[PDB]
Structure formats: C-alpha cells, structure tokens
C-alpha cells in the first residue's frame, strides 16, 4: 500500500520495486510493522536558508526524517559529507556513478550509389578510349572484321566470353596483350577504392565521459543538461572547473527527468547527464538509447536512520550479510538486468537493397532498350 498525496489529493495506491523488495526482505529479520507513504514535496532535501536570516532547513524527505515525521529512509538516497553531519548511514549496498545517455548511433548509413567510387569523368574517358583502341585494331588488322574487333575490345573489359574474334596481325596482337593489362588494372583499382570507402567510413565516435574534450567548450550540436535543483550540481557548480558547462546547462536545461528521455527520443536532446543506475536500466529497455562507458562521481546509495537509533549498527550488519548471499545480485538480474540489446563498435554495415538498387536501374534500362533495338534487325534486313 502507498498513500500518495500527489494524485491536493491524498490517494491510496500501490507501490513496489527493487528497494521495496529489499525492505520486505529485511522485514523478516527484525519483526517490522510499518506503514508506507510518499513525500509531499517530491524532492530529497538540502540545507537551505529560510526566512532570509532565520534558519537552515531541509527541503524534503531528509527533513521529514529530521523533522520527526519519518523514521528510516529506503530509496536511492545519495551519500556525501554535507548530509553526514545529521544522519547515520549504513554501509552502502549498491555502488553507482555518473554517466551520459545518447541514442543509437548508426545501424546502416554507408553507401549511396554504385558509380560512387569513380566520378563521371573517367567513366566517359574509358568509354571513349575503348572504341578508340577498337578502331585502331581494326585498321591495323585491315591493312597488313570490324564488328568482330568492336566486340573483342568492348567485351574483354567486361570479363565475358562473347564472340570468338582474334587478331590475325602482329601489331594488333602486341597491342591487345597490354589492352588486357589495362582492363585488369581498372577493375582492381575499382575494388580497392570501394573497399577503402567501406572500411574507413567512421560515422562518429560515441562521446566519452565527462572528460570528453568536445565538452571542454561545447558546440551547439551537443544539447545536454540536468534537472534544475538536483543533487548533481553540488558537484557541478560547487566545482570551479565546470562553471562553463554549468552556464551551458542552465541555458539548455530540460523540464523533467522524464522530459529528458522524451527529448532524447525526440531527436532534440543528443546527450544527457545523470547517475549510472538510473539510465542504465532504461538503456537495456529503450534499445534505441545507450550510455557511455565511464564513471565520474564515485559513490553508492545507502539506508538512512535518525541519529543513533538503537539498531543502526544492527541493520547495517544485516545489509552487509544479505549483500553477498545472492540477494543483491539475483535481485539485479531479475530487476535491473534485461540485457535485451547489446551494441558494439561501428558495425561493418551490411548491404541493403535500397543503396544497391542503382544497378537494377541499368538492368531495367537494358530491358527497355531491348524491345526498342529488336526491330532494328528486321529493318536492317
């Protein structure tokens, strides 16, 4: 049961999940009877000056613990110095860090058309030179079989076995013997160039952690931010070497944590900063979106208690002993480990029809040219 006052509507609904699982597990150890409710403010809490000179208060669930409302916190509550002066923390049960989100990069974006490795000039150049050498062979054979030689030439380039022509001269022979070499060279170089184009088409490298130099000062092709008034700025703004990124974010900020995913999937945010185990469980579910391999802020959540409850030490011992049997690992496997998708380096971009279709257009060109050319025999006869 879960009495959520943010439906002014206090409504009883239900709630569950990884944390709830750990709680319901731990319960059997120490005979816990417990109601459960949510936070009206919907934020963790931090030390903030109030009444403009009067006091320093905690604006959230942390305060609700200190205020006397709550008695123990179970949620992804962070650990640092500032909070440690008024709470008591169990050992951490789930380490984590700071990462970035980006959509899937490119499954197939490589080739356009088949003539691409050459450029139109050399095409027409060889198309001319072939008839050139053809008629030259023709004369050299004629004056010590025209259509014959025209075939022989314009075929040998095309690897076919059409026509049974030959040279009867000596000049034509010594010429064709290297005409063949030029033929082989063209096809060779063509293959080599196409291979080059298909192997060194690196679309883009996935941006690498916070220390990626592209972020040293960002180009406007890097939209990224956090949620205004999070606990991450306590390491962004409180650090001096990030104030530039701080200004970029305060201007690029997105509305909601869910608005971040909405905007990334909307091709309007192309990178997003947050904690590891918050996005990583959405990458392996939202297969079009994955993280970066790096970790920025070393910390791990834990359970909070009012200062010096008579079992602080006890629950910490239990959460330790219950961390290595199988509980955390198995609960992750069944609760955070979809493993539905697995990305890699820039794949070798399997060929699709839509960029290999161009040659079929010349196939259709031959098809149509047939029924035209056919009656030319009937005419010439």
């Amino acid at each position: 049961i879960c009495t959520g006052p943010n439906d002014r509507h206090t409504v009883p609904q239900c709630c569950y999940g990884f944390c709830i699982d750990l709680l319901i597990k731990l319960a059997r150890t120490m005979q816990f009877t417990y109601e459960v409710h949510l936070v009206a403010d919907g934020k963790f809490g931090t030390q903030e000056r109030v009444q403009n000179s009067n006091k320093k208060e905690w604006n959230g669930m942390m305060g609700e613990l200190l205020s006397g409302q709550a008695d123990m916190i179970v949620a992804p509550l962070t650990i640092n110095n500032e909070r440690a002066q008024y709470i008591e923390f169990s050992k951490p049960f789930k380490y984590q860090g700071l990462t970035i989100l980006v959509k899937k990069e490119i499954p197939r974006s490589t080739l356009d058309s088949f003539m691409q490795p050459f450029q139109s000039t050399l095409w027409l150049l060889v198309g001319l030179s072939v008839h050139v050498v053809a008629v030259m062979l023709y004369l050299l054979d004629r004056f010590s079989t025209l259509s014959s030689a025209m075939w022989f030439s314009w075929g040998v380039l095309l690897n076919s076995g059409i026509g049974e022509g030959a040279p009867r001269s000596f000049s034509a022979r010594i010429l064709g013997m290297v005409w063949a070499g030029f033929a082989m060279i063209i096809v060779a170089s063509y293959t080599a160039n196409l291979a080059a184009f298909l192997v060194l088409d690196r679309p883009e490298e996935r941006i690498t952690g916070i220390n990626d130099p592209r972020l040293r000062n960002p180009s406007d092709k890097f939209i990224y931010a956090t949620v205004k008034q999070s606990s991450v700025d306590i390491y962004f703004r409180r650090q001096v070497e990030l104030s530039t990124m701080y200004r970029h974010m305060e201007k690029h900020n997105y509305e909601s944590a869910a608005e971040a995913i909405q905007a990334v999937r909307d091709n309007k945010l192309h990178a997003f900063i947050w904690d590891s185990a918050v996005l990583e469980f959405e990458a392996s579910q939202k297969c079009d979106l994955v993280t970066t391999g790096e970790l920025f802020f070393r910390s791990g959540f834990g359970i909070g208690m009012r200062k010096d409850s008579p079992w602080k030490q006890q629950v910490s011992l239990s959460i330790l002993k219950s961390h290595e049997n199988g509980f955390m690992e198995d609960l992750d496997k069944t609760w955070v480990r979809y493993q539905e998708c697995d990305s890699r380096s820039n794949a070798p971009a399997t060929l699709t029809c839509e960029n290999m279709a161009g040659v079929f257009m010349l196939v259709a060109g031959g098809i149509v040219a047939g029924i035209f050319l056919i009656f030319i025999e009937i005419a010439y006869k």
Partner: protein
C-alpha cells in the same frame, strides 16, 4: 604491504633515512630495523593527519597476513588489533561480516570484490562470415532478375533453349565457370553484355564488403560468471582445465563457506604468493585466476602488453569495499568518516588514483589479424555443399518418380 597500496623500501644513506614523500615504517619486526613506506593509503593518512592532526607510529605485522582467524584466535592486522596492541590499522583490507563484528569499520573509499583473470584470446571470427555482407533481399532479387532476363531472351530469340540460358547466366555471376552455346542475334548479345556489367559490379562490391567484417572486433571468449557450468561442473563440458586462488585470505570464506565443489577442486591448484599465478598464466600453466578486484584491475593495466584482461569488468561478484579499521567503539570512528567523506567531494580521490592506479591498456586494442585454420567457422558453406548433395539425391529420385509413369 601486499600490493600496490603500500610499498616497503629499505634505508637510504644519502638523504637521512630515505627520500621525502614517504614515511618511516619503523618496525622492530624480528628479534628497531627501520624501513620506509609510500603508496596509496599512505597518502590518505598524510591527509587524515591534516584534519585530525595526531601523532602515529608505523609498525608492520608479525605474520604478514590479511586476517583469517583460527580457534577464535585472530591473525593478521586484525589479529593485532583484536588484542589492542595497536589502536588502528589501515591499508589493503576488505570488509566482511565476521570481520565487521569484532571491530568496527569506516566508510569505504574504493570499491572491490571478486573477478576473474585469464590469458586473453586468439582472434576468433564468427561462423557467419560468408553470409554477412548482404541483406537477404538482393539474394532473391538475383533469381528475380535472372528469370526476367531469361524471358527477355525468349522474346529476343523468337525473332538455344530456355532450359539452358539460365545455366550460362547463373554461371556468369560466379566468375565464369565454363563457356557454353553463346546465343546469337545482335539484340540478345546486347542484353547479355549488359548483364555482365551487373555481374562485375556485384562480385566486386561483394569482395569489397567482405573485406570489412575481418577488420572489426570479437572475443568475449571466456565466461559468464560463477554460475557457469564451466566453473561449477569441473569436467562435464571440458575435462582438463583448472583454476584457483590464493589461500590464507578473505576471498576464501566467501567461496568455501557458501559454495561446495570449487573449494575441494581448487584445494590442489593453489599457489603461495600472489605473482606465482602471474608466472603460471604467463606460460599457460594455469587456466583462470580468482582474487580480489582492485589488485587485479591494477595488475592487468600495467603488464608488458595486455594479454591478460578481466572478464568483462562491468560485472562484479560480492561487491564490497575497503576501509579503515578502528579498535572497538572508540570515539574516533565518527571523525575519520567525517574526514574521508570530504575527499570524495574535493576531487582528491581521482587525484590520488591518477597518482597510482591508472592502467596502460585503456584504449580498445587493435582487433588482431585472425589467421584461420578455422574449418569450424567456414563450416556453414561446407554444410550448404552437403545440402546441395542432398538436393541432388532427391532430384535423382524425381527421375525414377517420373520414370515409372
């Protein structure tokens, strides 16, 4: 000192007892034989003393162990804090429960656990090598265009035999099996010459792309985790391979006292001393190695060449932390915590890390040339060959099938 966290060093006669940036380990070990020490945790003590500001000796351990107990009597640094001969112990030390009970523990400052080390791999290539460079679509559009152009050949020579032109055409794509009856007639010859162009473009583009799949990565190559039959079944799938750990340590009880077989199986392939296993894995003497996390995540990244890499670091087993051990219920336990939780905020942790911990092979190494005797991965084409042979036998069956009628 049992790792790149504390370093022992003898005495220097030039600059006093030894250099700066190190602190004298003055331990009358065996009988005031002075040494001096430096490293990672030494640095963190030299910053603890900047906000608790006390005085401290530095004397090593009688037994050089990590803290296993016997008959309730304790050994190791724990063994010399339980008797409170020494008010506090730091350095490389895990955090379990049977240790968490006798004394207390601070907030951890670098996370560790269990992982596995193994000689890395050869260069494997998927059995699917042949099929890769195309979508299945073109592979049927092939037959489509073949049949339609054969029909056009029908139309043309109306003005060979159509159970034969297919033979020539299909042959031409696969680089000129054997010449046959060339269809006469100028128009026909034009159409076929056109087809040859599509051929030469096709085979070329093929070779081009198939010259890509052999230039990208591979080789997960080792395991899934402690749940694999590979580990728990010693001889089922592969009989002879064998691994182990080092006894005397923390990582024992978190396997023996919870897993059954691997303990009695490793009881015959354990090595005294850490780097003995490094020597073994250098020459294939042992197959796999299990130990603490951080010592491994270091020892790999600074070898000669990264021929020895973790098994998918992103996965860990029984993730716990190091820490700082204090005598029972002293009032200090708070301050040190309040102390250390500052340094995570001040970036100094990453600083000391870069001062010691970074490894060389951080970048993705070059996907190695996979020279192949690989009958295994090229097998699929042999199996399609056999499938052709079966189609042959059944087609011959069709002969008699028509023949009785």
């Amino acid at each position: 000192e049992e790792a790149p966290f504390v370093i022992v060093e003898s005495v220097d006669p030039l600059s006093g007892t030894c250099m700066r940036n190190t602190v004298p380990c003055q331990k009358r070990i065996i009988s005031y034989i002075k040494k001096c020490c430096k490293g990672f945790c030494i640095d963190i003590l030299k910053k603890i003393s900047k906000s608790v500001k006390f005085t401290y000796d530095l004397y090593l351990v009688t037994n050089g162990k990590h803290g296993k107990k016997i008959n309730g009597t304790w050994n190791g640094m724990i063994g010399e804090v339980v008797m409170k001969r020494a008010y506090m112990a730091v350095g490389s030390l895990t955090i379990n429960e049977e240790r968490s009970e006798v004394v207390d523990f601070s907030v951890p400052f670098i996370e560790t656990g269990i992982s596995v080390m193994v000689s890395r791999s050869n260069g494997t290539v998927s059995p699917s090598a042949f099929l890769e460079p195309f979508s299945a679509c073109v592979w049927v559009m092939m037959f489509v265009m073949l049949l339609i152009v054969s029909a056009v050949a029908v139309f043309v020579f109306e003005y060979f035999t159509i159970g034969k032109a297919i033979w020539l055409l299909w042959g031409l794509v696969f680089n000129n099996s054997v010449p046959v009856q060339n269809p006469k007639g100028t128009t026909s010859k034009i159409m076929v010459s056109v087809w040859a162009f599509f051929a030469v473009i096709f085979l070329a583009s093929y070779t081009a792309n198939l010259a890509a799949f052999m230039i990208q990565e591979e080789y997960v190559d080792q395991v899934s985790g402690l749940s694999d039959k590979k580990f728990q079944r010693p001889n089922d799938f592969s009989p002879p391979f064998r691994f182990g750990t080092v006894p005397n340590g923390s990582t024992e009880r978190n396997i023996r006292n919870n897993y059954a077989e691997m303990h009695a199986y490793m009881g015959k392939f354990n090595q005294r001393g850490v780097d003995d296993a490094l020597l073994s894995l250098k020459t294939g003497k042992l197959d796999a190695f299990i130990y603490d996390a951080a010592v491994l995540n270091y020892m790999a990244g600074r070898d000669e060449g990264c021929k020895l890499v973790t098994i998918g670091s992103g996965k860990v087993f029984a993730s716990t932390g190091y820490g700082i051990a204090i005598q029972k219920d002293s009032g200090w336990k708070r301050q040190v915590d309040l102390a250390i939780l500052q340094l995570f905020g001040d970036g100094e942790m990453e600083e000391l890390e870069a001062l010691w911990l970074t490894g060389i092979c951080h970048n993705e190494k070059n996907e190695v040339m996979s020279s192949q005797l690989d009958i295994d991965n090229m097998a699929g084409v042999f199996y399609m060959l056999g499938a052709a042979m079966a189609l042959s036998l059944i087609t011959f069956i069709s002969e008699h099938l028509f023949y009785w009628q």
